Design a protein around this ligand. Structure first.
Ligand code: BCL
Ligand code: BCL
Ligand code: BCL
Ligand code: BCL
Ligand SMILES: CC[C@H]1c2cc3[nH]c4c(c3C)C(=O)[C@H](C(=O)OC)c4c3nc(cc4[nH]c(cc(n2)[C@@H]1C)c(C(C)=O)c4C)[C@@H](C)[C@@H]3CCC(=O)OC/C=C(\C)CCC[C@H](C)CCC[C@H](C)CCCC(C)C
Ligand SMILES: CC[C@H]1c2cc3[nH]c4c(c3C)C(=O)[C@H](C(=O)OC)c4c3nc(cc4[nH]c(cc(n2)[C@@H]1C)c(C(C)=O)c4C)[C@@H](C)[C@@H]3CCC(=O)OC/C=C(\C)CCC[C@H](C)CCC[C@H](C)CCCC(C)C
Ligand SMILES: CC(C)=CCC/C(C)=C/CC/C(C)=C/CC/C(C)=C/CC/C(C)=C/CC/C(C)=C/CC/C(C)=C/CC/C(C)=C/CC1=C(C)C(=O)c2ccccc2C1=O
Ligand SMILES: COC(C)(C)C/C=C/C(C)=C/C=C/C(C)=C/C=C/C(C)=C/C=C/C=C(C)/C=C/C=C(C)/C=C/C=C(C)/C=C/CC(C)(C)OC
Ligand SMILES: COC(C)(C)C/C=C/C(C)=C/C=C/C(C)=C/C=C/C(C)=C/C=C\C=C(C)\C=C\C=C(C)\C=C\C=C(C)\C=C\CC(C)(C)OC
Ligand code: HEM
Ligand code: HEM
Ligand SMILES: [Ca+2]
Ligand SMILES: [Fe+3]
Lengths: 317, 258, 57, 280, 319, 56, 60, 60
């Protein structure tokens, strides 16, 4: 509740997204862009593959996701799929003491799916994931449970059965602002329309409730925050809708906002059954996936480092 | 919008509207702007602008009738005015050249210390008594509980050296604000009204420095007809003097520095 | 400085003296700052002083 | 020419840094040492810019290049040339204009002073104007410097300069939460309220009811002493005013000097230091 | 080095002046006027007393009601836990009715309190304009505040009764909280083109500027020549003087033309009124009229055109 | 030119051109360091010996 | 009371009334602040544990 | 208090009331401010850790 002068010493970042002197620009604190890199670092892949051997669907009692892989290569995977995931608990995390073909561990069940996740992604949505693709390190970054999940926010306390509004609060969810504070669930999870610009100058077209674009905002906020770039980045402001005016990035985000639709409404969602409570939300749910979950306030998780490229078993065949 | 005619709809009509009535009301003001001081005097130059009209594009408005307060004549505007004197000589005959203040400028009554002849009738308060009065009749008053009382503060010329002192600080029945300070000068042993507006307080040394006129000039300060109250005429009269000091009190001031 | 004592009857004692005192402080704060930006950022940048990048991490 | 009573104030001199030369008038304007210069820049701008209007985006031929105020706009150079003279065509020209405009407001500003002197008056006017002057520098200079780019300033477009804000504004998402922009805005409002009161009241006392006397402070100082209960006073209004405005400006000035070179996250966030208070 | 009328240096005081008495109908003034050296180191240190008629009370009452609603419902939000209420203050608020009950009386919950509270900041606001024209001329005073007040009160209704209710939407009407309200303006700009393109705003701006400009000049000017009683404009309006002499002259040898200690005060009252005027204009057009002002603009040959160093793709077309 | 220039001070005061130029030199004095430290050789942060800033 | 001995001279330079009404608030505020802050995170005895679950057990 | 011998003179230039009550606010803020900084970050002794959660174990 007091007037202020920036708490960051200059000079900052300087990306000219738009034509000389038009608007869309981007400013970032070097002193952060630094750490954020020196910290968002990828863990070097495992030594070369064997290339030799038969397969794994062969030798191993039960291996559906990685059946075509040579034993060795296949093992690299397990190792990776450990350090990327729970190198604190060891192999036993996704396995039973000894008997490795067991599917008596919900961790594995899903792990399995997580595989159908990554690859499917790395190969079919390369339009968003491109050549960097994704690994387990991404969402799990050295942690079994991704610190970046998102159960439909219940909202702030309820006044004697009476608090319907879901806008006014202020919650990091939205770079901080009185907004839906959960545009995700009705967007990233489900798929509520996101456009609101009236197609024609005059009226007699877009009858969208302002309140509707009022939500797009929040969403858009989060998005913009997740990657960590001002709406300038994907937009031409005056032209939040004129694609012909936007930037490449935009479209490249379009899909993304659907590859997630996918990932949530197709993978992390179903696997709720095998998932205990400690991973379920109050409204009863599965920590799905935000753009933040991977991005973690960056444009190419770990700023473009492509780990997934060094793992053949991570691509739909 | 600059080319000619392109699109066609409703709202764009209205934008024309307001942005029309504007150019109308604009004139209204223009006229209302001209009331006093009009028409102009000399031909030193012509009317700069697009359409150099006789005297202002908006035909001078009509007379306005100002019904003054109780026991007060009536004023109007416009209202022809009687030409004044020009106690000065043009440094150059060139139109737009300055006029030097013949003799002693400090009182030559010109520009830096010139002024009009406002009515010679003390402006009164709501009911009757005159607004600006000295703390004499302004006995029903009291210094702001806290602010160091100016009564007894020795004025000091802009030259620094003393120049009389003070007496009554002419308050006001309308707004408990000090507007003048009686200054029993040193050489004249008279009374010269001090225009607070020109008086800089120095509550640290009981002084009240006025970087306006040298200590001596307090002698040439237009004298007050009556000490118990001052009329508009003189209200402008005392002030205008010190004013000159701003561009007279020193050869330095008036002339450029670089 | 042998014949530079005369400059004082012209330049006032008070104005220049503290007029420069300030000139310094603003140039002083200004310099440390201009350089720190890029050149040498002795502050948060290396060792032994590296207790944040190494420690915090 | 002269006003009904102007003929008696046009003293000689009073100039600042010299000017006792061109110390004269033209039409109703005093020239001096600043009315002179400012002019220069004026045409070497008002017209230098015309060249721009002529040139346009691609070239003076590009269907892009037009002559409609609504569109015409001189664009600053690319962030490329940081703090260096850009090719007029690519940026410099813009700089050039801006070069001028600076002085044109520094002259007229000073010229104001010489005047303020002649008419042996107070100087509240210029001093005020300066803020307004400054806010133009710390919004095309003080900032772009701490951004290493001249072309990093704004354009000169009749409406084109609008977007320039649209963007740089969204560059922080909900620019609205900027602490300054809030206040600085608040002022540009309060001002537009008191003003809509003083200028009103007066024009309601000097020209009061039919068959009524030119009311006195003995009313004014009560007009609001009734409606709102208290009255800032009469002298005061002409204070609060300059205050508000001369602040609003200086505020906004901060408002966009810190936005960027002093803060990179979306403002909405800045507002977090609040939340995180070890209390609630 | 001259006392630049900043803060009334030395002050002085006299009894509580309960203003000029009022006719047959204007109830007794009320209050035991007070003094504050500080407040007074800027203006009339006296405080009060204040009037309170019918609309006076009637309006004030209709006032501290919406507050007691828009205030209550708000606190409720953060489940009557003030601590956070204090925290999430600038964020909190009270939203309007859901798009369903477009105009229908919203339930006691879903945006109801807002329509309730709203109407009570619809009357009291309109009633206070009465607490002006009334107490205004009953002073023998003409009406210019009362006037403007409308111009402003106009725009307020262009943000409600006249437009939100004009598009059938107990939503299209601004929320009720600093931030959220701070968002409505944001939201709006979007939902419909981008206001920077609706002239009547890009217009209403120049004004909010002029005022930010003029009342900012004449505030100085007066001061500059406040020694010469400039502040006393009142009389200067009638009996001129060196004030309006020195002043206007300034602007004469500055921007050329100039005016009168009267005139100015005119443009003043004007720019101001001609602000909220243009405000509610665009805001009225924007909604039931043009839907995207950006399109409008360019479609009229307005909106500029720059090169293109970046462009995107369009899923809805290639896909 | 300076040969007959001595007369200069007869028309100008000592403090007049005495400190104005000094102000002009300081303004130009640093106005230049910046503009040069910008293109020819951003010596401040341009090349070497970065040993301490880099290897450090 | 190593210094509290000669400390009496304190009433002389400090206004009795100004210092008396001042602590009156600082203490009045400091205390409401401390119970506000502690009660916020540390131990929110209010909506935190026992005796019984008036809400949990009663509501349902 | 060696300075004293040579330090007495300070009070002729520094008003007692201006510096006495003034530092009283300084001590009061910095302090409140420090707990605010330390507490909030370093170690939030209050809600941060031990002996252990009381409202958490008694609630469930
Ligand atoms: C940039 C790379 C180096 C570095 C290189 C330099 C260099 C090179 C210089 C400094 C200088 C200074 N540096 Mg360094 N400095 C670094 C890191 C630091 C850090 C840090 C936390 O890392 C700090 C806190 C400082 C702090 C300081 C200041 C003590 C000092 C003077 C600045 C000034 O404008 O005085 C303004 C001056 C005044 C207000 C007064 C004028 C002085 C006169 C002669 C005495 C006054 C007389 C008076 C009447 C008597 C009463 C005395 C007082 C005025 C009351 N540096 C890094 C490691 N630093 C400068 C310096 O201290 O030189 C000695 C300098 O030249
Ligand atoms: C992106 C959209 C954002 C946004 C982005 C920005 C950005 C970006 C900026 C502002 C700035 C400002 N915004 Mg904002 N702003 C938004 C919404 C708002 C709203 C609103 C109700 O919604 C309001 C009231 C404001 C209010 C304000 C002001 C506080 C502030 C300063 C303006 C100014 O007067 O500079 C005063 C300027 C001057 C005096 C210079 C011009 C005058 C010169 C000296 C003379 C010209 C002479 C001429 C060339 C000669 C020819 C003669 C002709 C007759 C004239 N903003 C939205 C949310 N806002 C600006 C700011 O903070 O500046 C400091 C700024 O840079
Ligand atoms: C750009 C390539 C080189 C370089 C090349 C040069 C060159 C070439 C020159 C300088 C000069 C200067 N450089 Mg270098 N410089 C570099 C990097 C730096 C860096 C840096 C951090 O990297 C710094 C801090 C400096 C700093 C400085 C200044 C000490 C110095 C004078 C500035 C000035 O105009 O004052 C301004 C002037 C005045 C105040 C007035 C003039 C002084 C008179 C004679 C005394 C006043 C008399 C008066 C009557 C009485 C006193 C009253 C007062 C006016 C109040 N340089 C790089 C490495 N630098 C200039 C210099 O030092 O000349 C000696 C110069 O010619
Ligand atoms: C940070 C980790 C520790 C901790 C470490 C410290 C440390 C380390 C220090 C404190 C100090 C303090 N801590 Mg702790 N503190 C902790 C947890 C707490 C908690 C808590 C609820 O958990 C609380 C409520 C406090 C509260 C306090 C204050 C009692 C105390 C002084 C504040 C001050 O600056 O004086 C403001 C000053 C003044 C108003 C005036 C100056 C004093 C002069 C000498 C006397 C006045 C003279 C006057 C002219 C005469 C007239 C008399 C009357 C005024 C009329 N701490 C945790 C556990 N705390 C400080 C302390 O107690 O020092 C003794 C200290 O140094
Ligand atoms: C809080 C301070 C407010 C303010 C105050 C203010 N303005 C002032 C003053 C004061 C006190 C004056 O004394 C001065 C004046 O009128 O003196 C008689 C003035 C003034 N305020 C002006 C404008 C102005 N003020 C504005 C705002 C404000 N002024 C603030 C609200 C704004 C806007 C956008 O909000 C504008 C446009 C001028 C009319 C006048 C100063 C005139 C002057 O000095 O002009 C010099 C130059 C020329 C006449 C020729 C121009 C040639 C140049 C080379 C070109 C410059 C191009 C320009 C940079 C691009 C513009 C394009 C945009 C559309 C992008
Ligand atoms: C261009 C036109 C500008 C303008 C003009 C304007 N405003 C005006 C007027 C005019 C001409 C008036 O005549 C009127 C006025 O002040 O009349 C005396 C007014 C006014 N402009 C106001 C506000 C205002 N104007 C604004 C803007 C503008 N007004 C425009 C810039 C703004 C903004 C958004 O920037 C605001 C916020 C009001 C001060 C006043 C109208 C007051 C009114 O109608 O009041 C009705 C009554 C009440 C609200 C009841 C109050 C209840 C109690 C007296 C207070 C108790 C405390 C309170 C509830 C706090 C909560 C505490 C709880 C713990 C209880
Ligand atoms: C194809 C084509 C046409 C091409 C064009 C080619 C051309 C024309 C090229 C030439 C370009 C050039 C050189 C242009 C410059 C020409 C000049 C000198 C123009 C004048 C510049 C200028 C600053 C004009 C004024 C700008 C304006 C109108 C600003 C509006 C702001 C505003 C509302 C101001 C109010 C003005 C008023 C009424 C002032 C008077 C006034 C005020 C303000 C008081 O406060 C006061 C207080 C007490 C007593 C009296 C007064 C008083 O009289
Ligand atoms: C003939 O007789 C004549 C007329 C001459 C004289 C007559 C005299 C008379 C009639 C006198 C009458 C006196 C009366 C009626 C007195 C009544 C006194 C009362 C009711 C006193 C009540 C006192 C209550 C007190 C002092 C309460 C103090 C409370 C304190 C200090 C609370 C502190 C609270 C804190 C710090 C709270 C923090 C809140 C949380 C914890 C929520 O913050 C997080
Ligand atoms: C619990 O509360 C306590 C007791 C602690 C007291 C504290 C209260 C507090 C702190 C209250 C704070 C309130 C605040 C901060 C309010 C802020 C409000 C803001 C910022 C509002 C901003 C904009 C508001 C607008 C534009 C409102 C417009 C309202 C309109 C247009 C209403 C129109 C109503 C109409 C037309 C009604 C017509 C009648 C019907 C509906 C019947 O016609 C069909
Ligand atoms: C480094 C320790 C690990 C070793 C030695 C190891 C070993 C093995 C072996 C031998 C198999 C094939 C067994 C069979 O079904 O016949 C297997 C399969 C599998 N392991 Fe691991 N594993 C390790 C860690 C992990 C971890 C940490 C995860 C958890 C994400 C995991 C997930 C899986 C899955 C999902 C399969 C089934 C493969 C498929 O369907 O394609 N393993 N592991
Ligand atoms: C926080 C600032 C942002 C705001 C206010 C914002 C606002 C909007 C709005 C209003 C739309 C809908 C326009 C329409 O079709 O009517 C939109 C669409 C879109 N935005 Fe943003 N946006 C922001 C940031 C971003 C960022 C950072 C990206 C890029 C990664 C992005 C990517 C998109 C895409 C791809 C669409 C169209 C597809 C869709 O979501 O339906 N936006 N944005
Ligand atoms: Ca809302
Ligand atoms: Fe006025």
């Amino acid at each position: 509740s007091v007037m202020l002068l920036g708490c960051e010493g200059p000079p900052p970042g300087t990306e000219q997204i738009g034509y000389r002197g038009v608007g869309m620009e981007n400013y970032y604190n070097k002193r952060q862009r630094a750490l954020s890199i020196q910290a968002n670092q990828p863990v070097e892949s495992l030594p070369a593959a064997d290339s030799t051997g038969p397969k794994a669907s062969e030798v191993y009692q039960n291996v559906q996701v990685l059946k075509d892989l040579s034993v060795g290569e296949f093992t690299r995977t397990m190792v990776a799929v450990t350090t990327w995931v729970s190198p604190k608990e060891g192999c036993n995390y996704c396995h039973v003491p000894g008997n490795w073909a067991s599917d008596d561990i919900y961790t594995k069940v899903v792990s399995r799916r997580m595989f159908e996740l990554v690859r499917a992604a790395n190969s079919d949505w390369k339009a968003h994931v491109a050549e960097t693709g994704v690994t387990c390190y991404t969402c799990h970054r050295g942690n079994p449970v991704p610190k970046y999940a998102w159960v439909t926010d219940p909202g702030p306390k309820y006044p004697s059965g009476l608090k319907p509004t879901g806008q006014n609060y202020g919650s990091k969810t939205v770079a901080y602002a009185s907004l839906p504070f959960d545009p995700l669930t009705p967007f990233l999870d489900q798929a509520n329309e996101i456009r609101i610009t009236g197609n024609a100058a005059l009226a007699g077209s877009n009858p969208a409730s302002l309140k509707q674009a009022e939500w797009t905002f929040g969403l858009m906020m989060n998005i913009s925050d997740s990657l960590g770039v001002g709406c300038t980045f994907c937009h031409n402001t005056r032209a939040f809708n004129d694609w012909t005016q936007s930037t490449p990035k935009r479209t490249t985000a379009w899909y993304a906002i659907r590859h997630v639709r996918d990932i949530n409404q197709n993978y992390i969602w179903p696997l709720n059954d095998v998932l205990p409570a400690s991973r379920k939300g109050p409204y009863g749910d599965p920590l799905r996936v935000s753009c933040m979950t991977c991005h973690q306030a960056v444009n190419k998780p770990l700023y473009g480092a492509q780990m997934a490229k060094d793992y053949p078993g991570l691509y739909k065949t | 919008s600059a080319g000619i005619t392109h699109y066609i709809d409703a709202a764009q009509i209205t934008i024309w509207a307001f942005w029309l009535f504007f150019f109308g009301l604009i004139i209204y003001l223009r006229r209302e702007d001209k009331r006093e001081g009009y028409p102009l005097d000399s031909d030193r130059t012509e009317r700069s602008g697009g359409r150099v009209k006789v005297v202002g594009f908006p035909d001078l408005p009509d007379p306005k009738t100002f019904v003054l307060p109780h026991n007060g004549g009536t004023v109007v505007a416009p209202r022809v005015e009687a030409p004044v004197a020009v106690n000065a000589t043009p440094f150059s005959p060139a139109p737009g050249s300055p006029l030097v203040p013949n003799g002693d400028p400090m009182l030559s009554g010109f520009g830096p210390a010139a002024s009009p002849d406002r009515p010679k009738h003390c402006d009164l308060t709501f009911e009757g008594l005159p607004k600006i009065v000295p703390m004499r009749v302004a006995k029903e008053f009291s210094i702001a509980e806290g602010d160091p009382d100016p009564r007894g503060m020795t004025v000091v010329g802009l030259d620094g050296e003393v120049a009389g002192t003070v007496s009554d600080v002419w308050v006001d029945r309308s707004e408990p604000q000090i507007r003048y300070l009686e200054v029993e000068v040193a050489a004249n042993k008279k009374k010269v009204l001090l225009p607070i507006g020109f008086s800089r307080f120095d509550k640290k040394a009981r002084k009240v420095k006025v970087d306006a006129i040298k200590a001596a000039h307090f002698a040439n300060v237009p004298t007050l007809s009556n000490p118990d109250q001052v009329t508009l005429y003189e209200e402008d009269k005392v002030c205008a003097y010190y004013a000159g000091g701003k561009l007279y009190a020193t050869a330095e001031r008036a002339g450029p520095l670089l | 400085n042998a014949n530079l004592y005369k400059i004082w009857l012209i330049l006032d004692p008070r104005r220049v003296l503290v007029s420069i005192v300030a000139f310094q402080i603003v140039l002083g704060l200004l310099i440390h700052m201009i350089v720190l930006s890029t050149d040498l950022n002795w502050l948060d940048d290396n060792i032994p002083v590296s207790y944040q990048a190494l420690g915090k991490k | 020419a002269m006003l009904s009573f102007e003929k008696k104030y046009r003293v000689r001199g009073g100039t600042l840094i010299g000017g006792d030369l061109f110390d004269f008038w033209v039409g109703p304007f005093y020239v001096g040492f600043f009315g002179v210069v400012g002019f220069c820049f004026t045409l070497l701008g008002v017209l230098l810019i015309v060249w721009g209007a002529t040139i346009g985006p691609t070239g003076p031929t590009s269907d892009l290049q037009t002559y409609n105020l609504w569109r015409i706009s001189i664009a600053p150079p690319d962030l490329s040339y940081g703090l260096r003279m850009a090719p007029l065509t690519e940026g410099g020209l813009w700089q050039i204009i801006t070069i001028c405009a600076a002085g044109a407001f520094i002259s007229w500003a000073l010229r104001e002073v010489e005047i303020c002197r002649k008419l042996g008056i107070g100087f509240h006017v210029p001093f005020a104007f300066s803020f307004a002057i400054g806010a133009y520098l710390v919004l095309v200079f003080v900032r772009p410097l701490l951004m290493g780019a001249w072309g990093h300033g704004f354009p000169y477009g009749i409406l084109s300069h609008l977007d320039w804000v649209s963007n740089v504004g969204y560059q922080f998402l909900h620019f609205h939460y900027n602490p300054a922009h809030m206040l600085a805005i608040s002022f540009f409002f309060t001002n537009c309220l008191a003003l809509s009161m003083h200028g009103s009241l007066i024009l309601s006392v000097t020209n009061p009811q039919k068959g009524e006397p030119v009311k006195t402070s003995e009313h004014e100082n009560t007009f609001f002493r009734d409606i709102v209960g208290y009255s800032i006073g009469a002298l005061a209004i002409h204070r609060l005013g300059l205050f508000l405005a001369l602040s609003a400006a200086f505020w906004s000035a901060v408002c966009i000097l810190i936005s960027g070179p002093f803060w990179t996250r979306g403002w909405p966030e800045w507002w977090n230091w609040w939340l995180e208070l070890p209390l609630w | 080095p001259e006392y630049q009328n900043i803060f009334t240096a030395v002050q002085v005081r006299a009894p509580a002046y309960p203003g000029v008495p009022l006719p047959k109908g204007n109830l007794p003034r009320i209050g035991r006027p007070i003094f504050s050296y500080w407040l007074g180191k800027i203006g009339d240190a006296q405080i009060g007393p204040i009037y309170l008629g019918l609309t006076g009370t009637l309006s004030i009452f209709f006032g501290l009601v919406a507050i007691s609603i828009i205030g209550f419902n708000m606190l409720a939000s953060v489940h009557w836990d003030v601590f956070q209420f204090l925290k999430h203050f600038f964020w909190l608020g009270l939203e309007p009715p859901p798009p369903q009950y477009g105009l229908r009386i919203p339930p006691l919950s879903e945006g109801g309190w807002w329509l309730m509270a709203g109407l009570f900041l619809t009357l009291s606001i309109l009633l206070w304009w009465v607490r002006t024209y009334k107490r205004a001329e009953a002073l023998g005073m003409s009406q210019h505040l009362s006037w403007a007040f409308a111009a402003a009160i106009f725009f307020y209704l262009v943000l409600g009764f006249i437009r939100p209710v004009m598009m059938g939407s107990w939503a299209k009407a601004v929320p009720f909280g600093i931030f959220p309200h701070l968002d409505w303006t944001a939201a709006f700009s979007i939902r419909y083109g981008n206001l920077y393109y609706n002239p009547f705003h890009m217009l209403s701006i120049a004004f909010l500027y002029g005022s930010a400009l003029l009342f900012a000049m004449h505030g100085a000017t007066i001061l500059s020549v406040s020694r010469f009683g400039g502040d006393r404009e009142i009389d200067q309006i009638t009996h001129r003087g060196t004030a309006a002499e020195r002043a206007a002259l300034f602007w004469r040898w500055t921007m050329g033309f100039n005016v009168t200690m009267e005139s100015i005060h005119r443009w003043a009252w004007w720019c101001a009124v001609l602000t909220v005027i243009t405000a509610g204009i665009g805001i009225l057009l924007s909604g039931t009229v043009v839907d995207n002002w950006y399109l409008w603009a360019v479609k009229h040959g307005m909106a500029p055109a720059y090169p293109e160093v970046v462009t995107a793709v369009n899923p809805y077309e290639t896909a």
